[PDB]
Amino acid sequence: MISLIAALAVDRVIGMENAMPWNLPADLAWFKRNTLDKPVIMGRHTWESIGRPLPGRKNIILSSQPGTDDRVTWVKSVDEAIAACGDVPEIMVIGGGRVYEQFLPKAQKLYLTHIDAEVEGDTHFPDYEPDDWESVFSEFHDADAQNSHSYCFEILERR
Numbered sequence: 001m002i003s004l005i006a007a008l009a010v011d012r013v014i015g016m017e018n019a020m021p022w023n024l025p026a027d028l029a030w031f032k033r034n035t036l037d038k039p040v041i042m043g044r045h046t047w048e049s050i051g052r053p054l055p056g057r058k059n060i061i062l063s064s065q066p067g068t069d070d071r072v073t074w075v076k077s078v079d080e081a082i083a084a085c086g087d088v089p090e091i092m093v094i095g096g097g098r099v100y101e102q103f104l105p106k107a108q109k110l111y112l113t114h115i116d117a118e119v120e121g122d123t124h125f126p127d128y129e130p131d132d133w134e135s136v137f138s139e140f141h142d143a144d145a146q147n148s149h150s151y152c153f154e155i156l157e158r159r
């Protein structure tokens with residue numbers, strides 16, 4: 001099964017010209033909880049944003065240009081990315097925009113963090129149809145001493 005995991009500001013904003021203007025360690029802990037010991041597929045801009053390989057996960061970079069880091073796996077097609085995951089119960093697609101757009105039709109599950117932030121977006125999560133998805137988990141949190149915005153965790157399963 002292929003799953004997508006993303007953090008969405010209002011209007012499904014996922015990326016901006018520069019780093020996103022929030023500080024959400026609790027969302028990064030949720031990201032880690034749901035990706036640990038699973039292969040993760042990402043695009044090159046997300047790879048640069050993270051800075052280093054994500055620990056405890058097989059890091060696969062989908063890109064048309066050859067790779068510039070030996071600590072991860074570089075693939076050039078969606079099918080090569082999936083084959084590089086081997087035989088695993090769940091593949092995690094972690095963005096960004098174009099990578100979400102390519103993997104959404106194959107995905108059966110979405111892990112979404114909805115962030116109460118009004119920002120002008122550079123890239124957006126795909127306009128999925130909520131009629132077509134079933135929320136099986138939702139958990140709301142206010143901003144606090146460590147987290148700058150209110151956020152809601154959601155898991156959605158393809159109806």
Ligand SMILES: Nc1nc(=O)c2nc(CNc3ccc(C(=O)N[C@@H](CCC(=O)O)C(=O)O)cc3)cnc2[nH]1
Pocket residue numbers: 005006007027028029030031032046049050054055094095111112113
């Ligand atoms: N829910 C969600 N939130 C995100 O911030 C997110 N970010 C990306 C792309 N960007 C990033 C940026 C940083 C890290 C990261 O550093 N994660 C660490 C935990 C952070 C920490 O320990 O300080 C990890 O080990 O997973 C992951 C993805 C893709 N899907 C997401 N999904």
Ligand SMILES: [Ca+2]
Pocket residue numbers: 134135136137
């Ligand atoms: Ca429900």
Ligand SMILES: [Cl-]
Pocket residue numbers: 026029030031033
């Ligand atoms: Cl968590």
Ligand SMILES: [Cl-]
Pocket residue numbers: 042043044045046047095096097099
């Ligand atoms: Cl990307």
Ligand SMILES: [Cl-]
Pocket residue numbers: 133134135
């Ligand atoms: Cl629902």
